[PDB]
Amino acid sequence: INVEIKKIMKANEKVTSDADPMWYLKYLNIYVGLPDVEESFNVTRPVSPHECRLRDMTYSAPITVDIEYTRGSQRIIRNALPIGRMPIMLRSSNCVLTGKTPAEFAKLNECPLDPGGYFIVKGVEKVILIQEQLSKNRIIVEADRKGAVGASVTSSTHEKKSRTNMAVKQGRFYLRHNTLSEDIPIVIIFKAMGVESDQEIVQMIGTEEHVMAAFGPSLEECQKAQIFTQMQALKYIGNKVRRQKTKIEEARELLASTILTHVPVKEFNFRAKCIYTAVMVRRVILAQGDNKVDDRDYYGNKRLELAGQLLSLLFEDLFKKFNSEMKKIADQVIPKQRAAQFDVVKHMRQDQITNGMVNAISTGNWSLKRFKMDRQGVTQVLSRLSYISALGMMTRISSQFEKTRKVSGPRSLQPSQWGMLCPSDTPEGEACGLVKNLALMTHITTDMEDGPIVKLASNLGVEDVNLLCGEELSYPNVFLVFLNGNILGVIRDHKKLVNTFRLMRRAGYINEFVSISTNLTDRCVYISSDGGRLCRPYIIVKKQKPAVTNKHMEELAQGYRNFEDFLHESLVEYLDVNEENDCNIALYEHTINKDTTHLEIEPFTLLGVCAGLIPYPHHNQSPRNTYQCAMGKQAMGTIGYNQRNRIDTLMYLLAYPQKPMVKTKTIELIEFEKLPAGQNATVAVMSYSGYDIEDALVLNKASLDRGFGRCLVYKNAKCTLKRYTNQTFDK
Amino acid sequence: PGTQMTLKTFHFAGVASMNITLGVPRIKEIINASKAISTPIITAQLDKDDDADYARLVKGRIEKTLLGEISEYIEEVFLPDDCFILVKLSLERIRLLRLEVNAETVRYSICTSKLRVKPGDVAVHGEAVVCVTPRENSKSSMYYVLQFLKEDLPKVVVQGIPEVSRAVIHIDEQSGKEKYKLLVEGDNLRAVMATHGVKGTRTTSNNTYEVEKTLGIEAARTTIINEIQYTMVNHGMSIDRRHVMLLS
Amino acid sequence: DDPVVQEIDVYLAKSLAEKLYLFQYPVRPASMTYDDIPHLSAKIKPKQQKVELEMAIDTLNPNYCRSKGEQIALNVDGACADETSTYSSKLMDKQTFCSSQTTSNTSRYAAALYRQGELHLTPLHGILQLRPSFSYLDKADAKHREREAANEAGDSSQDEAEDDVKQITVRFSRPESEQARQRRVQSYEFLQKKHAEEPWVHLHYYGLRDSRSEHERQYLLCPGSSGVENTELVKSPSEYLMMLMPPSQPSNVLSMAQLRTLPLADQIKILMKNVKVMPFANLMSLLGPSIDSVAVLRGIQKVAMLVQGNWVVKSDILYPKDSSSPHSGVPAEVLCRGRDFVMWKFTQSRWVVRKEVATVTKLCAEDVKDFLEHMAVVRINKGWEFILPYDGEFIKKHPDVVQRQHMLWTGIQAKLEKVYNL
Amino acid sequence: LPKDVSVAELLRELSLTKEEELLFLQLPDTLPGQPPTQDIAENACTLADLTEGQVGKLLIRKSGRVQLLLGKVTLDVTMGTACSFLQELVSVGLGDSRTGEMTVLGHVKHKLVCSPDFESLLDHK
Amino acid sequence: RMTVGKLIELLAGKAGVLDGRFHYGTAFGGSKVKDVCEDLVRHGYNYLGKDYVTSGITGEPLEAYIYFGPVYYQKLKHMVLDKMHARARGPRAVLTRQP
Amino acid sequence: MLLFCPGCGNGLIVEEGQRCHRFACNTCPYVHNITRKVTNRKYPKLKEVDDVLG
Amino acid sequence: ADFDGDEMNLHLPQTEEAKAEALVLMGTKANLVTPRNGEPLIAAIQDFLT
Amino acid sequence: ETLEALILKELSVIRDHAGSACLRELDKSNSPLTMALCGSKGSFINISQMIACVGQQAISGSRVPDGFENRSLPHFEKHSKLPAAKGFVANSFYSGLTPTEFFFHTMAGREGLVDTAVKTAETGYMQRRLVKSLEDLCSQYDLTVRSST
Amino acid sequence: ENEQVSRSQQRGLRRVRDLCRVLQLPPTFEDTAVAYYQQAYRHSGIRAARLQKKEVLVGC
Numbered sequence A: 001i002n003v004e005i006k007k008i009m010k011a012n013e014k015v016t017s018d019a020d021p022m023w024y025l026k027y028l029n030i031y032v033g034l035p036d037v038e039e040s041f042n043v044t045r046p047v048s049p050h051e052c053r054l055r056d057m058t059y060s061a062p063i064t065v066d067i068e069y070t071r072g073s074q075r076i077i078r079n080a081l082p083i084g085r086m087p088i089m090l091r092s093s094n095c096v097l098t099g100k101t102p103a104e105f106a107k108l109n110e111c112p113l114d115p116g117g118y119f120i121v122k123g124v125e126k127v128i129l130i131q132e133q134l135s136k137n138r139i140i141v142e143a144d145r146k147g148a149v150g151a152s153v154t155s156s157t158h159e160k161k162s163r164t165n166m167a168v169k170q171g172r173f174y175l176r177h178n179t180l181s182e183d184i185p186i187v188i189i190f191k192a193m194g195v196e197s198d199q200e201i202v203q204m205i206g207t208e209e210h211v212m213a214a215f216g217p218s219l220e221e222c223q224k225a226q227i228f229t230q231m232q233a234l235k236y237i238g239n240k241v242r243r244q245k246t247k248i249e250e251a252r253e254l255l256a257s258t259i260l261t262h263v264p265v266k267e268f269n270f271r272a273k274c275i276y277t278a279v280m281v282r283r284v285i286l287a288q289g290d291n292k293v294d295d296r297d298y299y300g301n302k303r304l305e306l307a308g309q310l311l312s313l314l315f316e317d318l319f320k321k322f323n324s325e326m327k328k329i330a331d332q333v334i335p336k337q338r339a340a341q342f343d344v345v346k347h348m349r350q351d352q353i354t355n356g357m358v359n360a361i362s363t364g365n366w367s368l369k370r371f372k373m374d375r376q377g378v379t380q381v382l383s384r385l386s387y388i389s390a391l392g393m394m395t396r397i398s399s400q401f402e403k404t405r406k407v408s409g410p411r412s413l414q415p416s417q418w419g420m421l422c423p424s425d426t427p428e429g430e431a432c433g434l435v436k437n438l439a440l441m442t443h444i445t446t447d448m449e450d451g452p453i454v455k456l457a458s459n460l461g462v463e464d465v466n467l468l469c470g471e472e473l474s475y476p477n478v479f480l481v482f483l484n485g486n487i488l489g490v491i492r493d494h495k496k497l498v499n500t501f502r503l504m505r506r507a508g509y510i511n512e513f514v515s516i517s518t519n520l521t522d523r524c525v526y527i528s529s530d531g532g533r534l535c536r537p538y539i540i541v542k543k544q545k546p547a548v549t550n551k552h553m554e555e556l557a558q559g560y561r562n563f564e565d566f567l568h569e570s571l572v573e574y575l576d577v578n579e580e581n582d583c584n585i586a587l588y589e590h591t592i593n594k595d596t597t598h599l600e601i602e603p604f605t606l607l608g609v610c611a612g613l614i615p616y617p618h619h620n621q622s623p624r625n626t627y628q629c630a631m632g633k634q635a636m637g638t639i640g641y642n643q644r645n646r647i648d649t650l651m652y653l654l655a656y657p658q659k660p661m662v663k664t665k666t667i668e669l670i671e672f673e674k675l676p677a678g679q680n681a682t683v684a685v686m687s688y689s690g691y692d693i694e695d696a697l698v699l700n701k702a703s704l705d706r707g708f709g710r711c712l713v714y715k716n717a718k719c720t721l722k723r724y725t726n727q728t729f730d731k
Numbered sequence B: 001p002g003t004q005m006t007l008k009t010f011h012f013a014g015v016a017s018m019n020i021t022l023g024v025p026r027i028k029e030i031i032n033a034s035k036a037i038s039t040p041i042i043t044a045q046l047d048k049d050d051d052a053d054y055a056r057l058v059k060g061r062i063e064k065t066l067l068g069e070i071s072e073y074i075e076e077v078f079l080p081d082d083c084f085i086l087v088k089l090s091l092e093r094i095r096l097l098r099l100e101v102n103a104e105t106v107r108y109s110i111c112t113s114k115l116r117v118k119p120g121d122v123a124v125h126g127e128a129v130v131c132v133t134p135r136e137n138s139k140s141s142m143y144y145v146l147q148f149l150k151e152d153l154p155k156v157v158v159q160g161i162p163e164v165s166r167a168v169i170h171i172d173e174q175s176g177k178e179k180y181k182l183l184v185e186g187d188n189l190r191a192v193m194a195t196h197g198v199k200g201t202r203t204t205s206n207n208t209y210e211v212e213k214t215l216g217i218e219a220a221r222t223t224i225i226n227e228i229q230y231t232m233v234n235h236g237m238s239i240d241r242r243h244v245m246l247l248s
Numbered sequence C: 001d002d003p004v005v006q007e008i009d010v011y012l013a014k015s016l017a018e019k020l021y022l023f024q025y026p027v028r029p030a031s032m033t034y035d036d037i038p039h040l041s042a043k044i045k046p047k048q049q050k051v052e053l054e055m056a057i058d059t060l061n062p063n064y065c066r067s068k069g070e071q072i073a074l075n076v077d078g079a080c081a082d083e084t085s086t087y088s089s090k091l092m093d094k095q096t097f098c099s100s101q102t103t104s105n106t107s108r109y110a111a112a113l114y115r116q117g118e119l120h121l122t123p124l125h126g127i128l129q130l131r132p133s134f135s136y137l138d139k140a141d142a143k144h145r146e147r148e149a150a151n152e153a154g155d156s157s158q159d160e161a162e163d164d165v166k167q168i169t170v171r172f173s174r175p176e177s178e179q180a181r182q183r184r185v186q187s188y189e190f191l192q193k194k195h196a197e198e199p200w201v202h203l204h205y206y207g208l209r210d211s212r213s214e215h216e217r218q219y220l221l222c223p224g225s226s227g228v229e230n231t232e233l234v235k236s237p238s239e240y241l242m243m244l245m246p247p248s249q250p251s252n253v254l255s256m257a258q259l260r261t262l263p264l265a266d267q268i269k270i271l272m273k274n275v276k277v278m279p280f281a282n283l284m285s286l287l288g289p290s291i292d293s294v295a296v297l298r299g300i301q302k303v304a305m306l307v308q309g310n311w312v313v314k315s316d317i318l319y320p321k322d323s324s325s326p327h328s329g330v331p332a333e334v335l336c337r338g339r340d341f342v343m344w345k346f347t348q349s350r351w352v353v354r355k356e357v358a359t360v361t362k363l364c365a366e367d368v369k370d371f372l373e374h375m376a377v378v379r380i381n382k383g384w385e386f387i388l389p390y391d392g393e394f395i396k397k398h399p400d401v402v403q404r405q406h407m408l409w410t411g412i413q414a415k416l417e418k419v420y421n422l
Numbered sequence D: 001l002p003k004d005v006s007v008a009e010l011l012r013e014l015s016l017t018k019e020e021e022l023l024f025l026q027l028p029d030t031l032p033g034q035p036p037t038q039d040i041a042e043n044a045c046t047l048a049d050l051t052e053g054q055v056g057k058l059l060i061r062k063s064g065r066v067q068l069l070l071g072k073v074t075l076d077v078t079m080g081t082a083c084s085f086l087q088e089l090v091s092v093g094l095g096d097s098r099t100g101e102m103t104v105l106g107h108v109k110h111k112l113v114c115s116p117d118f119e120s121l122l123d124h125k
Numbered sequence E: 001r002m003t004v005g006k007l008i009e010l011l012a013g014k015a016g017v018l019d020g021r022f023h024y025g026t027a028f029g030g031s032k033v034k035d036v037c038e039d040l041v042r043h044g045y046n047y048l049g050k051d052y053v054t055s056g057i058t059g060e061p062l063e064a065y066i067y068f069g070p071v072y073y074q075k076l077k078h079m080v081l082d083k084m085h086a087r088a089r090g091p092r093a094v095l096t097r098q099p
Numbered sequence F: 001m002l003l004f005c006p007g008c009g010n011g012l013i014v015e016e017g018q019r020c021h022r023f024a025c026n027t028c029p030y031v032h033n034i035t036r037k038v039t040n041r042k043y044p045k046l047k048e049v050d051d052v053l054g
Numbered sequence G: 001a002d003f004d005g006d007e008m009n010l011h012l013p014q015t016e017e018a019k020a021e022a023l024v025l026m027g028t029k030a031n032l033v034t035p036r037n038g039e040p041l042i043a044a045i046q047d048f049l050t
Numbered sequence H: 001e002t003l004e005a006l007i008l009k010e011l012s013v014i015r016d017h018a019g020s021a022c023l024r025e026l027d028k029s030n031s032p033l034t035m036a037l038c039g040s041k042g043s044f045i046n047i048s049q050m051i052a053c054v055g056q057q058a059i060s061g062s063r064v065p066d067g068f069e070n071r072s073l074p075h076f077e078k079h080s081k082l083p084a085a086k087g088f089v090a091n092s093f094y095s096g097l098t099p100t101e102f103f104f105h106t107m108a109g110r111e112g113l114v115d116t117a118v119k120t121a122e123t124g125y126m127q128r129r130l131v132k133s134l135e136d137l138c139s140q141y142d143l144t145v146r147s148s149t
Numbered sequence I: 001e002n003e004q005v006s007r008s009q010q011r012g013l014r015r016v017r018d019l020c021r022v023l024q025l026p027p028t029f030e031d032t033a034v035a036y037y038q039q040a041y042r043h044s045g046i047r048a049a050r051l052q053k054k055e056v057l058v059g060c
Ligand SMILES: Nc1nc2c(ncn2[C@@H]2O[C@H](COP(=O)(O)OP(=O)(O)OP(=O)(O)O)[C@@H](O)[C@H]2O)c(=O)[nH]1
Pocket: A376, A377, A431
């Protein structure tokens, strides 16, 4: 709501129509304002989330913007015009709950311990779960149904998304794209992308004996035909191109923009794309031998899209639709309406965006036609069964598969989930393995500018890939360096590069969220700077001694420093999955050896919110903990201090709730002791009367009479008396 | 029993290799009676089960042995008079594996479903040397076919059944005597029974379609019954034979 | 590791700064060079550097096929037209190497000529990759196309006069939309035409074996003394770092650096609001030794008070006028009065009773608990004790400050006795 | 052919032999200096702004360290990508607007890369 | 089920309710068994949780000691009153005349 | 092996001229006659002796 | 079953013939063994074997 | 694979010896031991796992696969095939499981859950097909099983 | 219905809806407005009127 909305408004700042030139509509700045209600007669009034829940309305703020247009060639400006309503998230920057004390929360009828972060539309509380997907702009080598070890890459840019594959079905590399009639050899594409020398092509593919032996068939198939020049290759490509020299022009355009969109070309300079496809073919050849097939379940290549990105995409799509509708209305009205000059303010529909947002948040089905994205189940009703239930449902993660096949691969627990997601917390049922929860200590990175990153990479001696041929890529000491899937270049002695980059990041000149990883099997150093990546804090260890000491901990306890000061003093740093894949971590101080770079902050943090309630979990079984979390997600107890004023369709409360005697540090952190969901009873483990044969238990009549286990079920009965079109009303 | 079974693993039947599909997937394949199954097994008995030499001999006879797996080097030599491919057969490895394969058998295997190479193209000079001199076929092919030859020649069958892909010598260590048998991961029981040294009277197979096509419908029924009983016993659960008999 | 030997000097030459190009052959190994290959010419352009070399290859050598040469010549050119021929004779004699541009800016690259005891650096104006171009094949394709057209036209023996007068097909110069105009500008044909619009310049080739090579090779050197202190290149490491990495542009939100970047007064105010208990020595150590003790004293005396040698933040600094109790909602004035009473009780006696403080201030339990935890700890069988010990060093060092704090506490005691009626 | 190092390369080029050699070094984007009277700003300072004369020294410490003292800071020189293809250094001087001269100065065999010692720049202040 | 964690929690809760404290069951740590055994033996109860118990029906002591202690039981929303169902003839569906 | 023309760099194929076999390109008149014997061994991995299982 | 919240169904026949058939064929005393292998499934369980 | 099998055999031998030692040192009248003897619930395997030592966590009949590059978790050295680094659980449920051991048990736990829970669909479909195919046969009075036709 | 309607009446209804939405009025107000517009259009004097007449009709 602060930066992305402004960027979208700047991208769509100017909109004009083809007919009647010199007419335009320029937006200057968009505002969201504070949450207001349109109940009063053309009057705004602050409304609270509790009042919204009670009245079954939406908790949104009026979206306003300033604009300037030309009615009759005379520029007319408007400093404040409403255009829609954006549902404001609770405890946000513009929300009324933020910056409030418990006294003000009580005055506004809201629980201070409420986690918030959910939207309120038409009275129901919806939460946007964190969607999980595969990392974009990355080569994935995998086996086909017939066992062929091929490669794939889904280049997704801000405009289009295209998945291009490469197969070795017949010993030669055939490239397949959705815009081609039939897959064509890779040598023809090489010749079409400027590089026509077979020697240069072979040097780019590789200089190894086995590489040449495996690539021979492709050269033979290419020589069989009469394709030897870029013109002939482009003609063949155009002939093989599907309908949407003209064919040559279309082939060149598809090679420059459509295929491998993530690889930029300065001016029809396909050098970078040629190097990229050569590296891809080299990886495919190296994989065709030893079965080093990459796995999809490796979360190091996963990206989590929070509600922010989804809302930004939805707002951009709705704004584009509104601009198109306004342009159409203008084209239809201005040329044949009347001498009276037409302006947009008379057709600036303010309900379009509001209805779009309300529907996208309520129904949960998101259909973005500009991106061809049809998702379902994005929003779910916040489970108010208990405070623990809500706090655990708020930190859930949905998968991209959505129960499309019982693969058992992604449903399994991968070692990559260390410290990021809770291993034991998982719903028991058909959604086992696809619905996960975040760990107690983790973070999700955002998008950076990458400017200083590229500058430092270029200054650290990274040689330009266009200055040297691809032969250097086959050397054992020359390691490639990639930046967000794009080939940043080559380098030698990657140890120095990685050390200097990490030292600079710790100093602070580079954002601490930029991850750097190195894979020796492929000799590739990846520099990740995109958002959605999972990171975890770790204490830096140097020469068998952590940087954090008792003095630092005492200063933190007294209040002289904070976690930000620790981050700035090169004491604690964030590590990504791909970074910890190469870095060494220690669990405890006694485990620290000579070959150690980081130290685990706390082990129990591996467990999630729902799992933190388990007292002594490492002494029990894993299915036990899973069932315990599943039952805690439905446990009965108090919701908040405003549970009496809260009116829901179904609520369960306990008469005499008591806090546990064996409470965990996670409980103390989440403040669950203040809102317990159970009671401590003097249980005696034994068999009595044979009424506890299979998991059953025997209760005491007197204990139940004295108030033990007394529960309260609160239901809501709603009735509506509305006025119809005619002047009549239900009475 | 489908629900009672947990689909365990590590059940190599005592060989610690040759992963075979057993459990609910195997029962599914059996009830489907597909012509081609996954990981088919063929158990064959030997006439001389106490001698390992004869066992390895029959193994080499039945197992497919490619030219590149026995030749120590294949070189495309372009002498100033002519170009040809010279294959050097490793007689040492041949006699170690006990394969009755020589230059004559290699020449006979060549010229079989290989771009119609005439007998005059292949020649023999030494005891373990094979010279192949192709010729332009005029069907969009020229003298530069030595590449395709180098590509598709090492994968030519010189001895063994084309259908058989792998064969191993299993040993039973009964206190009475230690016997040997052949476990073939192929889909051709007729060839295994026809090969010399194989006691075809006691040869069993896992592929119901092959059993039906070779030994008849009664043999297929008996094989289905035995396979279902074995797959059900592997999981420790027993079922009355009458159910499987009625199913078959 | 010290520089025992090899103390070589570095000099800079600007004679061939704008006349030095780096042509590299990705397809020609370093073993075989073009020194023996006679060159013919080189087409170049000042702007948008793209050089195309035209050389000559031998024919009488055994590594040349005369029949295929005649074939390719007859395919690329006509029978005896010879008005625009890629080859003078009927054989492939000339070869075309086209240049590809690696990068736009080549200022960071420099050629280093090494001599005995010195290394001369000369900037490069351009770097190009020369590769064998295939344009004779395109010309042969055009020749075949026109030959097929001529054959289709002359399919008959005698072609009658065709009345194919070119009608006036003058198409409209329609106003191209902005999107279509941008597409046309970004089209490859437009860029190719723009590059071709620039005229070519022909240059002669001088091999390394020529005397001109050794004659001009000396320009890479510069006349200068051995030891000369350069006027520039005297910036400090901090300045160099700032150059090579220019900038982009609870109450503990501000970090240590963001705090130090603020004035001393704001620094002390934030430190006190955060900690609420800290000795003067600790405050000095945290702020730094470069700041004056009198300045730190003047800054702390306005936002803190002296309690048993230690400094405690004032109550109004923690509780602004517009704030309220987060637990009871009472105004900030009552909280300030209660905190002042607590501090006075602590100054009068080291042991303070929570029950007595509550009964006096008429406040709830949670507020008193917070006030006591902010500046004391729990002790069994003794009540609440001050978190820090008695610091007599500061009291002995600053007697005037002690008297000022004593009179201030006396005034606060008078106010408390007037308000609560102690 | 084992991978050589800059120290041994300079040693065998100076002591074992005396013949001159053409080298190609890649310098950082911005040098630790200011454009002398170039009309500015903290912009990039390349060799095009510096004048002739002694600009820096090349030191070789023990253990194979090769440093470049270009003022108050000290960069480090390392061996770049070992290029094996032909690299001919030429100067194309357009003495006249109609005809010029292309002079082949020599051949390039080795490649060097100079990088700032960021560790030193950070531990200094 | 190998739920030794439940026994550890029960022992810790007993020690806590006896000594007026709150034991911690932090994962990969927390209060050890020795501390709670020391607390029990100091307060006079058995160091293993088992205590001498007498049968309430027959009034005679049991041959085996019973394992008593405080455990944090939580009730779930699944109620038999809500899950109880009994369908008479009742209505049917319009398309297909079935319940 | 895989040979390339020093002139253009395209693949060379073995053909028969008027005097002796030679490597030639399909895009230039460059050729190269064979003087001595040329060989390209591959050393395919032989089948190891599979020992008894049990 | 394990008495962990499982919901089971209960049906009441509406015909004397169906009642008799359910009592005879589906009798608990007559179906003490499974037709798979004849092993008795209705026997002692935990808290009874011990 | 030979080293893998040898390590698995050594771990199994250690597990069996620990279980035997626990069964021999445990005194009679013990409730777990009596229940495992009478067969009501539990077994010596579970007793040894919860008292003596937990067995090797086997995923798909093998050790814990290397999720990261050449190692299961970053806390172990690269190319390290140690028991504790590949899945061995030295501590028991009574003494407490380390983080890596608990993670491997949960991984094995997840495996179990998915297998049994979603495999069942497989058996449901198989049973549906088998019944729909075999619901036509019946025993006649002449001792001949005949179909509907 | 919605088939025996002319383009002029359709434009009038669309303008009514557009203005009702610009004023952020509820769908009940939108329905009442379209109903009154149809009731007024039922008459012939307003049916065959001016463009400004029908615009003011939407407004009223
Ligand atoms: N108890 C219960 N829970 C459900 C049911 N359906 C869904 N859930 C829960 O909430 C989820 C899925 O709800 P959906 O199936 O997405 O609702 P929907 O199918 O999208 O509604 P439609 O869009 O009309 O198909 C799962 O994660 C379940 O945990 C249901 O019928 N009963």
